Amino acid sequence: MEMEKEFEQIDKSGSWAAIYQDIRHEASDFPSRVAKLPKNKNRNRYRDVSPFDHSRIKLHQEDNDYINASLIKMEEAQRSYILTQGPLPNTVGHFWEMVWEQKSRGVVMLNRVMEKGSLKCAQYWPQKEEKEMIFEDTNLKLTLISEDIKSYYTVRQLELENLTTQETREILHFHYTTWPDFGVPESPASFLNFLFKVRESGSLSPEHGPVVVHCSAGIGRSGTFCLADTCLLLMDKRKDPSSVDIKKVLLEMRKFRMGLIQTADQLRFSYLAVIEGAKFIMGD
Numbered sequence: 001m002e003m004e005k006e007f008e009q010i011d012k013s014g015s016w017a018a019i020y021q022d023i024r025h026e027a028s029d030f031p032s033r034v035a036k037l038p039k040n041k042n043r044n045r046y047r048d049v050s051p052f053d054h055s056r057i058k059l060h061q062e063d064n065d066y067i068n069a070s071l072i073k074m075e076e077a078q079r080s081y082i083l084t085q086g087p088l089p090n091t092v093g094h095f096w097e098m099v100w101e102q103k104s105r106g107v108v109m110l111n112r113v114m115e116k117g118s119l120k121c122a123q124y125w126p127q128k129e130e131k132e133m134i135f136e137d138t139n140l141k142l143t144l145i146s147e148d149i150k151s152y153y154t155v156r157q158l159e160l161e162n163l164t165t166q167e168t169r170e171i172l173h174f175h176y177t178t179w180p181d182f183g184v185p186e187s188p189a190s191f192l193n194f195l196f197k198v199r200e201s202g203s204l205s206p207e208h209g210p211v212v213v214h215c216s217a218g219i220g221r222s223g224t225f226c227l228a229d230t231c232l233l234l235m236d237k238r239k240d241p242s243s244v245d246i247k248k249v250l251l252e253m254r255k256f257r258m259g260l261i262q263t264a265d266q267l268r269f270s271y272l273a274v275i276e277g278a279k280f281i282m283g284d
């Protein structure tokens with residue numbers, strides 16, 4: 001079926017939970033043996049969210065190459081994304097090592113450091129120009145260059161230096177600051193505006209390594225971001241945009257990381273975002 005009318009048909013019939021449970025039943029199951037080794041317990045935030053072995057990002061280290069991060073490679077859309085958990089106190093150096101080694105231009109953050117009165121990820125970037133951060137375990141230096149605070153999101157320019165070679169690179173930090181502590185946003189307008197700002201920066205384009213996107217577990221809000229982006233790109237590429245099937249795209253992405261889209265409300269929000277976004281791309 002088309003999307004917008006499949007949407008109204010699920011709303012009127014109140015069957016979002018049944019649709020979402022079908023997706024969970026059909027989703028791929030691949031091994032995640034490296035994630036579960038005892039030496040990696042303090043490298044995982046949640047015991048039930050792990051990268052598959054076949055798609056995990058490897059650190060370029062011989063001691064321990066493990067990080068909780070996955071490469072999502074979308075062949076028809078010609079887009080790739082790295083989805084990862086929010087960094088832990090003992091993985092902030094690994095996180096920036098990955099950004100460096102994978103040649104990423106942008107980092108997309110979809111959570112606040114504290115939500116619901118608890119810490120959802122480490123404070124992993126510097127907050128003042130004159131107070132830079134040094135990660136001694138991976139030999140990197142990170143400096144805040146500039147910060148632009150808007151009503152729904154903040155964009156930061158960062159300098160990452162590999163202290164071993166003295167090479168430097170400019171990284172863009174795109175921080176969506178207004179996702180509610182409970183539920184999903186009422187309108188997708190600010191989330192779509194944010195997605196378009198990431199696109200306009202070059203961070204999603206083939207002349208760079210994959211964008212790094214995270215929330216707390218790296219599967220819920222993070223899954224919503226890449227699902228909406230890929231569906232909109234396919235609607236631009238195909239002769240028949242109504243052929244794009246958001247459930248089929250989500251199941252393809254779940255071949256590369258488990259659990260993408262965590263609730264039926266996140267599934268409905270993803271439909272809403274793609275529907276509204278497809279009107280702005282053209283003229284309605």
Ligand SMILES: OCc1ccc(-n2cnc3ccccc32)cc1
Nearest residue numbers: 232233235236241242278279281
């Ligand atoms: O790239 C954004 C983009 C491109 C095309 C379209 N689009 C045009 N006609 C359509 C019919 C059905 C569904 C989507 C449609 C939307 C969004």
